[PDB]
Design a protein around this ligand. Sequence first.
Ligand SMILES: NC(=O)c1ccc[n+]([C@@H]2O[C@H](COP(=O)([O-])OP(=O)(O)OC[C@H]3O[C@@H](n4cnc5c(N)ncnc54)[C@H](OP(=O)(O)O)[C@@H]3O)[C@@H](O)[C@H]2O)c1
Ligand SMILES: O=c1[nH]oc2cccc(Nc3cc(C(F)(F)F)cc(C(F)(F)F)c3)c12
Ligand SMILES: [Cl-]
Length: 318
Amino acid sequence: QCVKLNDGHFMPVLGFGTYAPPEVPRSKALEVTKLAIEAGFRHIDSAHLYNNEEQVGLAIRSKIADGSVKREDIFYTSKLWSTFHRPELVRPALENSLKKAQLDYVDLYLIHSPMSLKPGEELSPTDENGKVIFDIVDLCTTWEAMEKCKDAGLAKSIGVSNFNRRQLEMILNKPGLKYKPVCNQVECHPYFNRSKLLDFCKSKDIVLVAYSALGSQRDKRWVDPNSPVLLEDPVLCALAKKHKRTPALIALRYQLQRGVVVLAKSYNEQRIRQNVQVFEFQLTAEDMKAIDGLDRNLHYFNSDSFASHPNYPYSDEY
Ligand SMILES: NC(=O)c1ccc[n+]([C@@H]2O[C@H](COP(=O)([O-])OP(=O)(O)OC[C@H]3O[C@@H](n4cnc5c(N)ncnc54)[C@H](OP(=O)(O)O)[C@@H]3O)[C@@H](O)[C@H]2O)c1
Ligand SMILES: O=c1[nH]oc2cccc(Nc3cc(C(F)(F)F)cc(C(F)(F)F)c3)c12
Ligand SMILES: [Cl-]
């Protein structure tokens, strides 16, 4: 099952999340991405930030070489990291991502975050006192360079991630805009369901793509350990028992039924195989309303250190 993007391309509605923290050996990304394709995932979400594009690309090429899929059957996403927003850096960053993955094109290239950072080799450039160094970049010029990557055939579609309404409007209202973003990939789950942003995106022909749809990896470096564990929610657990599924499957199916494309990370073979069951059942309208009732404006990623960034996306209502 796919959704038609505003540029005519098609995006599978269930995507495999590939981020794993640095303590996980890089070889794991190759192993689990192969498992994901074998289980039925056809949309694969990576990024420069994840330091795994070589391994994720190897997995895609493995499943092509063994005859399981063709390149046209796979929807591969990468993302432009925030140290590469300056327009002259955009196409080389994409070409480097393609070289790592050994792919001729990505199906989707995203601006990973609106919060530009100092250009250089470091993913998180810091000054003398350990403070992250921001950069000021007109994201409309970044977007024009993204459009040129689409026209060059290096990205089939282009989109954004972690943008709020105001930041989307800045692109949408840009003079001489050639391609709208096809999507906005954002944190989205029953405790932070993004209903207003979803409505806005629908009104602009933009797909909302949910990350941390299972409640995030709860990495103690960026998630409060005292935050509620999404998959332990009593309503999700009751719905799982009713449908003979699992809380994770309820959380994924919720997004599909509200028009949201949903990512799911797992580095566990059994859970990878479980997650494709999202297509095997339906939630009732009443079930959906129960899940809607869980919304509590809870964002798992602790971005408070970036609150002073002029492009911090979470200060606006949506
Ligand atoms: N654009 C961005 O800024 C951004 C930010 C965050 C994430 N993302 C993308 O979105 C992907 C997913 O988001 P996420 O990484 O926050 O993780 P997630 O999808 O919310 O999953 C969180 C945890 O759920 C566990 N899990 C998976 N399937 C399960 C199941 N069936 N039952 C129980 N637990 C299950 C996984 O643990 P195991 O691995 O142990 O199964 C995983 O660590 C990322 O990998 C990345 O591709 C993008
Ligand atoms: O993409 C991802 N996959 O797994 C992840 C785990 C943690 C953070 C991620 N992304 C990210 C998003 C933001 C946001 F949302 F605030 F824009 C900021 C930053 C950072 F690190 F720059 F602060 C990183 C990702
Ligand atoms: Cl990298």
